[model samples]
Target: KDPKFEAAYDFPGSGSSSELPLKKGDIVFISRDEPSGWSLAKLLDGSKEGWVPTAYMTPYKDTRNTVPV
Candidate 1:
């Protein structure tokens, strides 16, 4: 089954120390919080999975954007 598309977001950019990193249309917030003060997330790029702060993502639509730009 396809992974249910949860809340997608547009994290333009930030200069904070979190984890793997965030980008457009390739983030899935799975779990992790409070225990270690980090938000666990699954990414869609190289090594597509890691942790970050919950305050770094902004909710947005997940439409396909595939351009070799």
Candidate 2:
């Protein structure tokens, strides 16, 4: 949700690219900022981080139906 980009970014690891498709239910993390495209984002796997389009991400939905503790 950085102001620099219009889409949600992901932080996978450090300098890797996302090999998988960013699905609607996938959880991702933000790493750093980039000049173009999408910022780096890491999947919940914590194995890889890569640049993803910001439009792929939506507000974190409550899958658990409970407040995150």
Candidate 3:
């Protein structure tokens, strides 16, 4: 499985086709990282996917408790 990450900072996109905008606390899974300081990522919601700066991401943990509805 791909490693999941939490956005440690807000990254407003540059309007580039490959850039991925991210907000603080946003969760994403990174498929790989390039030495140029970018990583391929997709949001947990599976809506948006693109490249984001590797420096802006951190390890993500599912801290929320599941509800038994």
Candidate 4:
């Protein structure tokens, strides 16, 4: 099953003023284990790590990126 994804912040959450808006099909990388219901994930381009719901993370599928020399 694919990990579920969700918005990192809402209009009232922490850093909401500077939070980046999320769009459908956007890819993000997990940063750390939040364990408080949300997981820390960083955007592929930006270094901003935010608390995202763990229910959004699907089983990471390594297509070509996992292949090592």
Best by TM-score: 3
Task: Give the alpha-carbon lDDT of every model.
Answer: 0.50, 0.52, 0.89, 0.52
Residues 1-69 of candidate 4 have per-residue lDDT tens digits of 124343433423455633334554556776555557666666766656566566555544446476775
- Clash pairs for candidate 4: 2-58, 3-56, 3-57, 3-58, 4-56, 4-57, 5-56
Clash pairs (backbone) in predicted model 3: none
RMSD of 1: 7.6
Candidates 2 and 3 compared: the better one by TM-score is 3
Q: Write the per-residue lDDT of candidate 2 for residues 1-69, one digit (tens) a residue.
A: 222222244424344435334544566666654666455667665775567765555546445567666
TM-score of each: 0.40, 0.49, 0.82, 0.50
Clashes of 1: 0
| Model 3 lDDT per residue over 2-62, tens place | 7899999999989997988999998899988999999999977777789999999999977
Kindly provide the TM-score of model 2 when superposed on the true structure, using C-alpha atoms. Answer: 0.49
Error of 1 at 26 (Å): 3.3
Ranked candidates (lDDT, high to low): 3, 4, 2, 1
